[PDB]
Swiss-Prot record, chains A, C, D, E:
Designated name of the protein: Recombination protein RecR
Keywords: DNA damage, DNA recombination, DNA repair, Metal-binding, Zinc, Zinc-finger
UniProt record similarity statement: Belongs to the RecR family.
Organism annotation: Deinococcus radiodurans (strain ATCC 13939 / DSM 20539 / JCM 16871 / CCUG 27074 / LMG 4051 / NBRC 15346 / NCIMB 9279 / VKM B-1422 / R1)
Record-linked InterPro entries: DNA_Rcmb_RecR, Hlx-hairpin-Hlx_DNA-bd_motif, Rcmb_RecR, Rcmb_RecR_Znf, TOPRIM_dom, TOPRIM_RecR
GO biological process, any: double-strand break repair
Top-level taxonomic group: Bacteria
Length: 198, 229, 198, 198, 198, 229
């Protein structure tokens, strides 16, 4: 590799997740075939974003305003807060067409191992948002990390007068028990819902 | 390039002995068989899905490298409604011989699935969409002239060819006017227009039977979607 | 070369699921390197099983007796019936270490390429097994097929006096929301379990 | 449940290559649905083959006779011997419609987990088959194993008066340089064929 | 999706090859977690490149100078020209450690179907570079496109006094005949190299 | 994340009946089994390779989604030299019990393969690197004291434990000084330093034998790499 500009692009691109050396090069030689209007629009989009994009002060969902669109929106159920690990989960639980409440983003998951505690995550700004006649849905992951963060959150929010809930551990949609993990099945079972009471 | 991004609807799924997932997709550019070795089990029937496929050295079967869930219909989990996409999916797959197949056929197929998902009368949707699909396949029943002698405006069933016979060539009584009217104009006029003019459930079996006879006489195959009727 | 013998083995092996032409050949040339005691034990084992194995008359779980080991076993909770699509699910839900009840096997999934219907599936022999003070857990798949079969079963079993339940649609064990399907999340959410009331 | 019969089939099927536990079970429950005529024909076919099939004494290609069909066949070019690692390669190079010579099967690849060596491979019975006015095509793999076996074979056969050749290292059919390994390209290049001299 | 900045990034990223909607979002939420020094360096790298990057006037290999590093470099064999489809192939055939000659980049492949002819590809600027006592290695793909482009190039370059060669069609390194395409094998065979002449 | 990029050396390959490619890799973060369903057949022995692996729901086997060819050694296609990476790869895999394994062990292993690739005496490289690897595994032969009674500076073979016995505990004659010197200082001193001081091919079998005895007595396993000697 010689032209430093190409060596420079491969590097920066390869610094991105899900894109190795071989794929970065594959990518640099595609950018070469493109017309300058796009490269600029890609660059600008990146920058516009890096500048315009900031974390919401209330919940910490990503936006470019004073409050996130969720916080602003008045038709949104102002009584339920869905705590989540990452802003991407907000989209996931949003494009899920079954939740119109408020969200809250701990920008990560707890992990005692790496001294990462409820001070490296936006857990503080959540407390004041929680009151009575409200529900706090805990939608953190299901790794020992998500499981741990949630139980920590449960403990913390307890003293405030809200209903705390955790999303359902269970078999995913479109699967058969045979290929479902053991611990999942045991949870899908113990957490079984009654569809009819005699 | 030579991986490609494709979007479409899951019309069939296999879970093999090995534990793979082979799926047939109907797509705008449609006709796609692919396999996802082994997470990506949102590749269930009737899910609209985006996939990254790598074909490779002429392997007869492309392979999945990422699948999205672009749009589902949970309503389709219901029994009566569900009984109108299988026939829809199995019908479409049989009807189109594999070269065939734009984007028009795909939009109509997707429409038929929203139809059977949200609409009070899934059977009527399935009937209308099936005959409508006959147009986009270029297999249109001749309805203007008796199938045997050529006489204009035949009213009678055609047991041998699924079309219509005149009173001289027919051995069976004439179809009821609601059935004739549908047979004559359904392929040509709007899907909206036909939903607005249902046919009594009593007269529908005659409509299904004509479709079966027509399609088995005109298109090759072991039309297994009739288990669908 | 044309020994109907090698050509014959490739075919029959390849007539098996999960095993393509290339893999069948790979398999025939491995059987060649094997001693005779094994080939016989593979062939006898085959013949055999096919003989001793039949469907259970009560539930239709696979066995070689009058009643399946589940039906026979007296320590098994005689009051809960877990309806399933395939005998393999019985193993899956058995090696799951959380269920000691009775099973029932509809041999398939409602409708696939044609009307497998409640007459092509062992739905009839189930009705008489269902009584009051009993529970019918519906453990059919989660495809539109499994979803449909279950609701059909629910309808049918309703008139009998048993509690009907369906397994929990939900996130699988060992996953994070980011890679979880949208419809799953919405179900894991709406089906959330309360871990603590205030 | 514990029928050594189902548990026994899963094991033996799973003792087979390419077929894991989950797939073995998937396979046992399919054999269950099958009629008896087939199971027998699968078992007999097995027993059988194991019996009729043995290694050819001349070349060691698989057969059920005194000499392999290749050795027997009189229309086959009796002057070229294609050395190969496995009997499956004979099929591959046979269904290739471009070779009517004789084959020779070293049963494996030099060294894998231990010294398969020229005494663990049918290299001896090859020497006497090689004479002058003959060609020995080396069609062993291209792994360091195949590469090594071949060079060993070249050395060995040298003293006999035959032309020794190796198959062409090169880009595979139906590919583009972009996705072709580096070392392959360098070989496809250094081994370039002249299509026209000036 | 609401914040137009996020919707805008997903779009532009998703406009890139090998990156679908789901992956673009996955990517936007990763860029969010990053410190501004990188976003800028990515943006700049893109732009620097879009500005500094141009096609070489001699051969059309990508660079930022008057002549490509290959053209400039004096230790490079000035007598061999390797015609290639894309600048990425130059890297591939460069990181191949077996070629120190000059390259030439047709920025594509011929294709009669789409009126794409030797006027949409840098075939003209090649002719003047070809003289006698020189070799033109044709390293275009092996699709009907690469095969066709090459034969066209062969025809064209013929009248000039150089040796024309094509890279070797053949089995790729690290494969076994069994999984090698039929047409490849037939080429690896007909193009076999003699390793020893009696 | 939860796909990951990993780089390492292919030490084993299977091509299954199905047509998959299961490979073991030695990596700086080392110890990696993975499978590439079905293009990516540059995953051959001793190739240095970059891979994108998706683990997934605790599947015992990660899966390949892209493989690069970062660095090969075509020289290793030669017979004598080749006979010194199998033993190197098979030796390393046996020696390390699976928790174990930094980056030091990996650099040394990679070095050993360049060694057997480019150097006149591949056997000597393989000997030196094998004993050197014993250090990075924390399985160092005690050489200062007789293995039986403790006496300083033993010179004699130890048939039971691979170490050294004094003249009172020994039933066999003393090792030759070149062998003793190697045994005493090889694990500790530089690889460069040892390449500069070879041992006569005549005395090498004694060196191999001690390594075999030592390693089978100290590390569990069915040390199949001895077919490697
Ligand atoms: Zn907000
Ligand atoms: Zn008529
Ligand atoms: Zn039973
Ligand atoms: Zn023979
Ligand atoms: Zn240049
Ligand atoms: Zn002693």
């Amino acid at each position: 590799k010689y032209p430093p500009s190409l060596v420079s692009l491969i590097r920066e691109l390869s610094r991105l997740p899900g894109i190795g050396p071989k794929s970065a090069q594959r990518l640099a030689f595609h950018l070469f075939e493109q017309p300058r209007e796009d490269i600029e629009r890609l660059a600008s989009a990146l920058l516009e974003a890096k500048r315009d994009l900031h974390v919401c002060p209330i919940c910490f969902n990503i936006t470019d305003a004073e409050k996130c669109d969720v916080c602003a929106d008045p038709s949104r159920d102002q009584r339920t807060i869905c705590v989540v690990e990452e802003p991407g989960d907000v989209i996931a639980l949003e494009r899920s067409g079954e939740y119109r409440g408020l969200y809250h983003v701990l920008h990560g998951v707890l992990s005692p191992m790496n001294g990462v505690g409820p001070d490296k995550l936006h857990i503080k700004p959540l407390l004041p948002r929680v009151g009575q006649g409200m529900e706090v849905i805990l939608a953190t992951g299901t790794t020992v990390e998500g499981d741990a963060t949630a139980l920590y959150l449960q403990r913390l929010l307890e003293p405030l007068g809200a209903a705390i809930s955790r999303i359902a551990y269970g078999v995913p949609v479109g699967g058969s028990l045979e290929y479902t993990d053991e611990v999942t099945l045991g949870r899908a079972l113990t957490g079984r819902q009654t569809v009819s009471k005699p | 390039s030579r991986t490609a991004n494709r979007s479409g609807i899951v019309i069939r799924r296999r879970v093999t002995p090995a534990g793979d997932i082979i799926v047939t997709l109907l797509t705008p550019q449609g006709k796609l068989k692919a396999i996802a070795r082994g997470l990506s089990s949102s590749l269930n029937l009737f899910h609209h899905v985006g996939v990254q496929v790598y074909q490779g050295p002429h392997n007869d079967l492309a392979s999945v490298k990422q699948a999205v869930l672009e749009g589902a219909l949970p309503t389709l989990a219901e029994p009566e409604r569900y009984a109108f996409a299988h026939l829809m999916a199995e019908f479409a797959d049989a009807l189109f011989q594999e070269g065939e197949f734009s984007e028009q056929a795909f939009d109509l197929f997707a429409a038929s699935l929203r139809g059977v998902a949200h609409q009070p009368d899934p059977e009527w949707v399935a009937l209308v969409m099936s005959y409508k699909l006959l147009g986009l396949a270029g297999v249109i029943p001749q309805t203007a002239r008796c199938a045997r002698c050529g006489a204009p405006d035949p009213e009678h069933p055609d047991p041998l060819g699924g079309q219509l016979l005149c009173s001289k060539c027919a051995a069976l009584p004439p179809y009821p006017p609601a059935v004739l009217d549908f047979l004559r104009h359904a392929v040509r006029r709007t899907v909206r227009a036909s939903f607005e003019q249902p046919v009594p459930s009593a007269d529908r079996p005659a409509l299904w039977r004509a479709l079966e006879k027509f399609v088995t006489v005109q298109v090759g195959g072991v039309h297994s979607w009739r288990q669908l009727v």
